[PDB]
Every structure is written in C-alpha cells, then in structure tokens.
C-alpha cells in the first residue's frame, strides 16, 4: 500500500561549525526506492542537491535517508526540512525542525563569571576605598 515515512528525531538542536545529520526511515512494503529532501521557505520549497556549497550530503538506501549538513550556519541552515519518499505505490513526507545554537549561548558561564567578578570588585572597591 501507500508508504509511511517518519523521522527518527522530529526536532534537533545542534550548534554552528558542526554537522547535523537528519534521518528519515520507513518500513512499508514495497520499500521506498527513492528519497528527496526539501528545505521549507516562505511560499516555496527548494530541493537539496548533493554537493551543494560543498557542504550538503545525502546518503539514501532502501527505506532510509540521511541528510548531512556540514558547517552549520546561523542564517540559512535553521528551519524546517521535509523528507519525501516515493515507493512504487505512492509517496509520503516527514517534517524535521533544525535549530543552530551559537557561541553566545555556548560561552554563557564565561561571560557570566567575568561579569560577576567585575561587579564584585567594583562593589567592594567603592564600599571600602571611598564609602568606608
């Protein structure tokens, strides 16, 4: 009958500089022979060709396809991706959402610490030097 495809992880949260691997799978019979990945944009969905910007990779087998995105970018990579599998009896699609965490959120306990140290030094240095 018609194929039924689903994502392994419906939502992921990776960071820039790394490489996200989204994967769809299916267990219908006949198996899904061909897979196609699209990135959702406003009013239109753009196909993801292998080798694009020397950073995209697609590895497809019967009923399973991995989308590798190298060098996560904060501007174009985050969003919604649709995987579509077309078996001889029809086709199906799944939606995966990808977010890119940056170094702003990554180096949070470094700035936090140095800010607290600065505040403490200023507080004590006014509380004693001139106030006391």
């Amino acid at each position, epitope marked *: 009958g018609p194929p039924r495809v689903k994502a*392994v992880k419906s939502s992921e949260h990776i960071n820039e500089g*790394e*490489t996200a*691997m989204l994967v769809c799978k299916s267990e219908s019979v006949p198996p899904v022979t061909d897979w196609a990945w699209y990135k959702i944009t406003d009013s239109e969905d753009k196909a993801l060709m292998q080798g694009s910007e020397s950073r995209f*990779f697609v*590895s*497809s*087998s*019967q009923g399973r396809s991995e989308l*590798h995105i190298e060098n996560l970018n904060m501007e174009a990579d985050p969003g919604q991706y649709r995987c579509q599998g077309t078996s001889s009896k029809g086709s199906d699609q799944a939606i995966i959402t990808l977010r890119v965490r940056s170094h702003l959120a990554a180096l949070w306990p470094f700035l936090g610490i140095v800010a607290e140290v600065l505040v403490l030094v200023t507080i004590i240095f006014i509380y004693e030097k001139r106030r006391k």
Partner: antibody
Amino acid sequence: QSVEESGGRLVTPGTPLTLTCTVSGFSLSDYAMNWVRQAPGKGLEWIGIIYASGSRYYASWAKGRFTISKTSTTVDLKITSPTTEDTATYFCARYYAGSDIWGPGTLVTVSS
Amino acid sequence: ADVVMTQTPSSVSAAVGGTVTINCQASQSISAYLAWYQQKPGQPPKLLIYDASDLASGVSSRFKGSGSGTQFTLTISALECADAATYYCQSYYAIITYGAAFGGGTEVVVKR
C-alpha cells in the same frame, strides 16, 4: 544477504596487500560498506567506509595508510605499507543502520 | 576530530537471571545514533540495537538500549549462559566528519 572476505595471508613489512570482500544477495550501489579491523585479543578499530555514490571516508588515524575502492560486486581494501602493528582480522560490513551484515573476516599477518 | 567513545565498565558480572547495564559516553553530541554489538570469541560481531533504542531484527527483548545526547546505556535482563560475550558501542553521527569509532568493549561474565 551475506558477504565473504578473502586475501588474508602473511606478508613482510612494507609489501602492499589487497583484501577483497565479495557481497552476495544485494547490489553494492544500494548500500554502503564499512571496513573494520580487530587485532588479536583487542577491540574493533573502524578503518573506513565507501558509500553507494562512491565517496570514501577514512578514520583519522588511518588517513593515507589504506585505500578503499569498489567494483560492481566486490569491495577492495589496499594496504600501502603494512607494519608489524597491522596484523589483525579484517571484516567487511553492510552499512544500513550501524553495520548489520558482517563477514567471516580474513586474517592479515605482518612479520619477518 | 574523530568522536571517541568511552565505554564503561570494562568488566561486569551477574548471576543467571539478573540484570546488567553498560554505559557509553560520547565525546560530543551524537543525538540518538549509537549502535550496540555483541561479539562472541572467534565469531563476527552481531548488531543488537540501532538508533540507540530500536531493537535489531530477530533479537530478544532482554536487550534494551536507552539514552541520548552523550550518555547511552544498554541493559540485559534474565541473563542466560549464552549471553557471555564482549559488547561494543559505536557512534555513527555524521561519519563524514566524525568517523565511527568503536567502544573499548565490555566483557560480560555470568556467575553460575
């Protein structure tokens, strides 16, 4: 669905050597193939992988020391300069989700 | 940089019918892309669990993989004497960039 390695033997350090993994029951253009080695009484070392499209990726420690290629029915693994530290059993494995189908493995000994 | 897998403990024992757990720690976030293998002496490894939780085909329910991120854990229950073997974890998260390094191994000894 099964695979069978061949080409294991004794060789002198430096002499190149080519191992062959023959698949059976599926085409090499619809599945990737991994090459994994295991020294006597040690763990498994992942050597490399050849995808269906033909792209080949090798492990960090094994860059340059090996070479993977493939024909329509067999996958070949060439060792350019075997060392004494290269004696191990070599398995070929079909990559779908992890490595499901594995081969019996062939033993490669490098000694004088 | 290749992802390195830190499999602990090295050895684990339990009585017939008990339950064992094994933890694998990934050097970085690998999401749920960890496979577990059971290698008996001499024979080739056998895939037990893929995607960190899905059971392989024809595998008993006694094996249960759990975890995500960087921490994973395999658990066996009603330990039979046929479970004596070495178990290995393996990451396959974006192999083209981090490789698929294997774990150190976990010798499971049954206590009769």
